[PDB]
């Protein structure tokens, strides 16, 4: 909507209905998408998708990955190999705003395996004030650029520090 030739890639080969999910979000918002029902390697979906949208001269190529936790070293190595195959200009750490004390440990282990440079805080439209974001800014060394404020595609806006600290304080 700002004028960029944006496109999506679904590099999730594990979650059920994950390419069907991003396909129906991209079909609705009129955005090109890439992914596979059949490919089981996310390094292969993400390399062959950024290669296709490079040769089509897109300016914003957003690669979606599966959910992973730090105690799974198998998914943390696969995340590092998806990041090494496509070599992303920016890595965004999306965190739920209802996360408790377990936030600083996961957010730090994401910064250690992969180079996180921006943080996004979703599910802030409800009761959660999002105090877990102080522990993912200190762990990933990355600022918050956007917040999510609902389930729809337009429930999305840039992070402003003053209204988030006034809500976090009361």
């Amino acid at each position: 909507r700002k004028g960029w030739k944006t496109c999506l890639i679904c590099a999730d080969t594990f979650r059920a209905g994950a390419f069907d999910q991003l396909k129906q979000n991209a079909t609705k918002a009129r955005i090109p998408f890439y992914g596979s029902y059949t490919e089981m390697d996310p390094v292969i979906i993400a390399s062959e998708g950024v290669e296709k949208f490079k040769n089509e001269n897109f300016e914003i190529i957003i690669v979606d990955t599966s959910g992973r936790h730090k105690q799974e070293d198998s998914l943390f190595e696969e995340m590092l190999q998806v990041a090494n195959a496509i070599q992303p200009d920016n890595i965004v750490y999306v965190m739920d705003a209802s996360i408790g004390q377990a936030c600083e440990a996961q957010a730090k282990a994401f910064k250690d395996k992969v180079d996180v440079a921006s943080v996004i805080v979703t599910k802030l439209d409800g009761h959660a004030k999002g105090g877990g974001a102080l522990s993912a800014v200190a762990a990933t060394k990355s600022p918050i650029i956007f917040i999510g404020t609902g389930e729809h595609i337009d429930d999305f806006e840039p992070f402003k520090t003053q209204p988030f600290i006034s809500k976090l304080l009361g």
């Binding site: 129906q24 979000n25 079909t27 609705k28 729809h152 595609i153 337009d154």
Partner: protein, 195 residues
């Protein structure tokens, strides 16, 4: 032997065979024309075989023979079933002897005449004194009396004429049809979609 035709009407009314108890009752009404027990076994075989107007023509053709040995329930029941709730109400009240058969049909006649204050006192006494397999069906009848006080197509030949059937979509969201017809100026994000 009419005692052997009555062990045959008895053996067919026990097995639920009111089609053959009605052929064996019409063999006792050929020898005994005014048999009041064979004019009651025939009215039951016609109420059970769904002839309520043929069972009401067996009661009205023999009004003097079935007199005071009457079928005032099978007569107020055939009329209750032929859309006569004013004749089914007059035959329950004019019955010479009141039973628990005319009390069960009278709880269903009061409910049809929308007399729910008398139908509640009839169905309160019917749930107390009745010991049968239909006590869960008589607490659903009393629970409906308490809840009561409180292919046309425009034309058929024009169906297979224009384009054998209407548009294949043919009824669905109006905004989903190939016609659209919603005067839509643009798309906006209100509800869930994603098709």
């Amino acid at each position: 032997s009419v005692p052997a035709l009555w062990s045959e009407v008895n053996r067919y009314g026990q097995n639920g065979d009111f089609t053959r108890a009605l052929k064996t009752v019409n063999k006792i009404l050929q020898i005994n024309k005014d048999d009041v027990t064979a004019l009651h076994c025939k009215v039951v075989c016609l109420i059970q075989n769904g002839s309520f107007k043929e069972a009401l023509n067996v009661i009205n053709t023999h009004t003097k023979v079935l007199a005071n040995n009457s079928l005032s329930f099978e007569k107020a029941y055939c009329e209750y079933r032929l859309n006569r709730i004013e004749n089914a109400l007059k035959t329950i009240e004019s019955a010479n002897q009141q039973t628990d058969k005319l009390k069960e049909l009278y709880g269903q006649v009061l409910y049809r005449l929308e007399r729910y204050d008398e139908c509640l006192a009839v169905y309160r006494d019917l749930v107390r004194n009745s010991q049968d397999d239909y006590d869960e069906e008589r607490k659903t009848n009393l629970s409906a009396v308490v809840a009561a006080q409180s292919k046309k197509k425009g034309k058929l030949p024009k169906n297979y004429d224009p384009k054998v059937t209407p548009d294949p979509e043919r009824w669905l969201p109006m905004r989903x049809x190939x016609x659209x017809x919603x005067x839509x100026x643009x798309x906006x994000x209100x509800x869930x979609x994603x098709x």
